[PDB]
């Protein structure tokens, strides 16, 4: 009984990158052993969130009554090598027939724009619904390009606007924009530029960054160009690269603005010397409580490729305290698809009476239901009409203290709360 598999009357896919590995040349046409790679505690947590959402719905006589939900889940540390599990979800009796009812009715994920751009075209072809809990690339709002694509996090445009709100709420107008050397980081660069062109904000420096960036010289330029505001648009790995290198190089008295991919990071706030590099601000997904997840995790800590975690002797409380961002996006993803299937079978809420994944797609678009008192819907592009951003400040207790908030159709900041280094 694997964590990655679970039988059911209808299968939903699950795309996660639980492990990390930098890209590397390969001479053979075969999957990667991700299990022997670098574990990611926050991703495995989102991983578990999917498993919890399916179990919770399976526990319900209200949503999909007497219709079990199953799943095939994957750990795709490399987007290049994800296709075998992709082929799994889209196959009919493990055959792919390119010219023509598949194993799965839809898929939750992937996390990464890069994972998404690599595989989404194959999904779109038959209007096979993908619901991403993470991909923020603004190219995904173009619905002709990605017709069966939807998501539960906002576009980069929105987050970039919030970041710019933060910048404008203060007095600094030269900025460094450090961004990850992938499609996510790049899109962020594009959107940031697009947003500040007609503005007192002057982009004074930028650079694609990776784990092997000469951070020593990136920071001399930034200093000699006297920049105090350093926006870092990057996910966990790249974020820790920047910030950790910032402490090792007496980078000091800067204002760092985080995006929601590292503003609730847990390694960096508790790190020795972090307070010496200035002050950390960011937009964050506001922590949403998911009743019952805690008990679930305690219960869980207790083959085909990329379906092995290799993660025993894992601390239950490490897991629970890991960066909780993207929780509700995963939560609302699974529930979104479940509701869409519930309505395509035309279930009541007592019982349910052939499901093509595109039939799931039309109900997915029409999504309208409550979840933890949030309304879950999408616009005609597939972008979510729910979620907000809080403005946090990293304080002396290692906490991302909430000091303001942003709402996508309406920023406010209580500046006294920020204690500047």
């Amino acid at each position, epitope marked *: 009984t694997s964590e990655f598999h679970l039988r059911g009357d209808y299968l939903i896919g699950g795309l996660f990158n639980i492990h990390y590995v930098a890209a590397a040349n390969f001479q053979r046409p075969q999957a990667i052993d991700c299990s022997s790679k670098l574990f990611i505690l926050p991703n495995y947590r989102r991983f578990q969130m999917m498993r919890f959402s399916v179990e919770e719905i399976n526990n319900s006589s209200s949503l999909l009554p007497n219709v079990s939900l199953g799943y095939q889940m994957f750990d795709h540390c490399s987007d290049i090598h994800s296709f075998p599990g992709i082929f799994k979800l889209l196959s009919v009796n493990d055959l792919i027939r390119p010219w023509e009812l598949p194993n799965a009715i839809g898929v939750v994920g992937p996390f990464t724009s890069t994972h998404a751009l690599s595989i989404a075209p194959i999904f779109m072809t038959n209007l096979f619904p993908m619901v991403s809990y993470g991909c923020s690339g603004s190219v995904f709002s173009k619905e002709n390009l990605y017709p069966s694509f939807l998501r539960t996090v906002h576009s980069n445009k929105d987050v970039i606007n919030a970041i710019v*709100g933060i910048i*404008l*709420n203060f*007095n*600094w*107008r*030269w900025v460094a924009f450090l961004y990850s050397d992938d499609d996510f980081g790049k899109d962020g660069l594009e959107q940031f530029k697009n947003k*500040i062109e*007609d*503005s*007192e*904000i*002057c982009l004074a420096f930028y650079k694609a960054i990776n784990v092997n960036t000469d951070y020593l010289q990136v920071f001399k330029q930034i200093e*000699e*160009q*006297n920049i*105090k505001v350093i926006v870092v648009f990057a996910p966990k790995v790249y974020a820790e690269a920047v910030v950790e290198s910032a402490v090792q190089l007496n980078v000091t008295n800067k204002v760092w603005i985080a995006d929601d991919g590292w503003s609730l990071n847990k390694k960096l706030p508790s790190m020795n010397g972090i307070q010496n590099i200035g002050t950390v601000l960011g937009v964050a997904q506001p922590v949403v409580t998911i009743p019952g997840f805690t008990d679930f995790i305690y219960s869980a800590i207790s083959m085909f490729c990329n379906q092995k975690c290799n993660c025993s002797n894992l601390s239950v409380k490490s897991l629970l305290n890991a960066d909780p961002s993207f929780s509700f996006p995963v939560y609302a993803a699974v529930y979104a698809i479940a509701h869409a299937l519930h309505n395509t079978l035309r279930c009541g809420s007592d019982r349910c009476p052939t499901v093509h994944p595109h039939m799931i797609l039309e109900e997915l678009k029409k999504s309208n239901f409550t979840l933890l008192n949030q309304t879950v819907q999408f616009d005609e592009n597939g972008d979510p009409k729910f979620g907000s951003l809080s403005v946090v400040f990293w304080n002396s207790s290692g906490n991302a203290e909430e000091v303001g908030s942003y709402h996508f159709q309406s*920023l406010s900041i209580n500046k006294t709360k920020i204690k500047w280094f």
Partner: antibody
Framework: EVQLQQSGPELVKPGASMKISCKASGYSFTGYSMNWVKQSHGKNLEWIGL????????TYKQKFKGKATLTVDRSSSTAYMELLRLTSEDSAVYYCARSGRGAPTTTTAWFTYWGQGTLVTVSA | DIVLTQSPASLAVSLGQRATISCRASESVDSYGNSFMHWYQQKPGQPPILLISRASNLESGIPARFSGSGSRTDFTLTINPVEADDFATYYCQQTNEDPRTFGGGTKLEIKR
């Protein structure tokens, strides 16, 4: 074209109040500080203050605190400056001026676009 | 508050010759690797036009016969050659620190 259009000249009584407007067009209103400048006859430029049209934060030169109030209306892209308890010393020309792009702080910003100006005449 | 003292207060320059206007600040107006001293031209009845920003950066649309230099507390505007419509008051302006302050102005007359 960026334009800053101000109110016509005003004749206003001593000890009364008046509000000068600066309709902005041709750029994104909230992206730049709007500044105000007094010039007496006896030509000297004097900075009254600025406002951030994004959040309404204001900054003033000391001698104009309690004498000037800068506001904005984002639905009309207008900056306002209300003058209070007017004496003949407030008889001057007032300019609204937008900050430029290129400065490192909102404070260091210089003035690239100017209103045509508003003559204020304080008299009974 | 930084005092800017311009000299001379008044100046008449024949056509095609050189005008050198100076501005002295009470404190340095250097910061961020720059000098926040700017030059404005105000013609009679008009708003000031920004000629030069940050001590020496010529602004769009302003002829290269206008130029400036200086740093810290000593700055100069030069007009070379002078032309017939350059009579105006020329103001320097610091924006290094709050509040912004202006020099008392130099009035350039065309000498003929």
């Amino acid at each position: 074209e960026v334009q800053l259009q101000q109110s016509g000249p005003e004749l206003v009584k001593p000890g009364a109040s008046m509000k000068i407007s600066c309709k902005a067009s041709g750029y994104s209103f909230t992206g730049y500080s709007m500044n105000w400048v007094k010039q007496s006859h006896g030509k000297n430029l004097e900075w009254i203050g600025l406002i951030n049209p994004y959040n309404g934060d204001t900054t003033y030169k000391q001698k104009f605190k309690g004498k000037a109030t800068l506001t904005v209306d984002r639905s009309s892209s207008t900056a306002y400056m209300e003058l209070l308890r007017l004496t003949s010393e407030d008889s001057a020309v007032y300019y609204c001026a937008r900050s430029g792009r290129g400065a490192p702080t909102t404070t260091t910003a210089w003035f690239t676009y100017w209103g045509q100006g508003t003559l204020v005449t304080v008299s009974a | 508050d930084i005092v800017l003292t311009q000299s001379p207060a008044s100046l008449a320059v024949s056509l095609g010759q050189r005008a050198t206007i100076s501005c002295r600040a009470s404190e340095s107006v250097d910061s961020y690797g720059n000098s926040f001293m700017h030059w404005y031209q105000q013609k009679p009845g008009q708003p000031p036009i920004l000629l030069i920003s940050r001590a020496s950066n010529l602004e769009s649309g302003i002829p290269a016969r206008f130029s400036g230099s200086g740093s810290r507390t000593d700055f100069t505007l030069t007009i070379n050659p002078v032309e017939a419509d350059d009579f105006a008051t020329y103001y320097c302006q610091q924006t290094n620190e709050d509040p912004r302050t202006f020099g008392g102005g130099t009035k350039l007359e065309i000498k003929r």
